[PDB]
Amino acid sequence: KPHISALNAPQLDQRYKNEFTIGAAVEPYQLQNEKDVQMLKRHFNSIVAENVMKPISIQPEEGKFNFEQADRIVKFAKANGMDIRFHTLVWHSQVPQWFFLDKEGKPMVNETDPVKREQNKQLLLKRLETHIKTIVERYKDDIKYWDVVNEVVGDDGKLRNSPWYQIAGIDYIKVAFQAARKYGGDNIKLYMNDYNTEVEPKRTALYNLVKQLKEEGVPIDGIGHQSHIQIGWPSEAEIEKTINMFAALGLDNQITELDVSMYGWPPRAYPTYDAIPKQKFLDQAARYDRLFKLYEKLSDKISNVTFWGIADNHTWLDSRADVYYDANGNVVVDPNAPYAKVEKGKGKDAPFVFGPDYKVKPAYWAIIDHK
Ligand SMILES: [Cl-]
Ligand SMILES: [Cl-]
Ligand SMILES: [Zn+2]
Ligand SMILES: [Zn+2]
Ligand SMILES: [Zn+2]
Ligand SMILES: [Zn+2]
Ligand SMILES: [Zn+2]
Ligand SMILES: [Zn+2]
Ligand SMILES: [Zn+2]
């Protein structure tokens, strides 16, 4: 199957249009790029902001809201008939730090007086409610799908002990969902998004958490499975088990940040795209073939599959693509092999079905067909 321009190729969203939407994560500058715009128009019918809707992008100082960049993505989506996902109302990553300072400008996490800790909790929950209120009041008629909370369960199966949790306890999760519903109404759909949703003990902890919130009347409509995965892990069998169990609780499932890395964890990357062997792309294609056959099998439980990017010339996985060198200066990609130095984040991953020259990869043909 030829390495043809993806602008010449059968439309990916149309292949899946009765099964689920097909989305991409974007940065506003990509909307000024001819090739990226043509890619979005041709292949995608859902969009998400890679970064300009995160809390520090939207309210970096209290009372200073920057919707300019987010508005550019919303405008493009509407003009092209695309669904929008909001990434994300609450996350421990890069919080604007003002959220967690007390009235005296000290870190709330250090407060030891119980009465004052309770005061800090209420202050923080109020700041949280105002952040969500302002964003949802602006976009409730434009954005259908919301990552209300992100990564709130730890890899150890305990709630993540971020300042959110330290200062306010489980109530910051409840307040985030209740505020989203209060200001956006019944028609926006509210998700808890996380990575490694297939992996125990995280999986069961996530399951028990959303079960509990629902039994208490907290409005949660779905789970977002980031799906930052590898060629071999996690198995399709375990992805299937995961999606089924959340569906059994009455939740929608979205695949929200899909990328299929060429590497293991921690990655030992090639320094450049050209150095990645051809066989890796065939292995990746087989993986995508199996993955999307599975997503189709479960399409009554999945409303959306979003890739965390458009084509391989731009992927956040490059930030993880550490290049290992031996004593002689040769690149080392075997995880158990000797090495002398590492260049963190300087290598190249290749996670999508579209290559860096916007031509289709073997993985594209593997998911555009009906086999
Ligand atoms: Cl990135
Ligand atoms: Cl190429
Ligand atoms: Zn389309
Ligand atoms: Zn090159
Ligand atoms: Zn190249
Ligand atoms: Zn579906
Ligand atoms: Zn990016
Ligand atoms: Zn090429
Ligand atoms: Zn296939």
Swiss-Prot record:
Coiled coil: none
GO molecular function term, any single one: endo-1,4-beta-xylanase activity
Enzyme class, UniProt record, top EC level: hydrolase
Pathway: Glycan degradation; xylan degradation
The protein's Enzyme Commission number: 3.2.1.8
Record: active site: E151, E257
Claim: Transmembrane helix is one of the keywords in the record: no
Family: Belongs to the glycosyl hydrolase 10 (cellulase F) family.
Name under which the protein is recorded: Endo-1,4-beta-xylanase
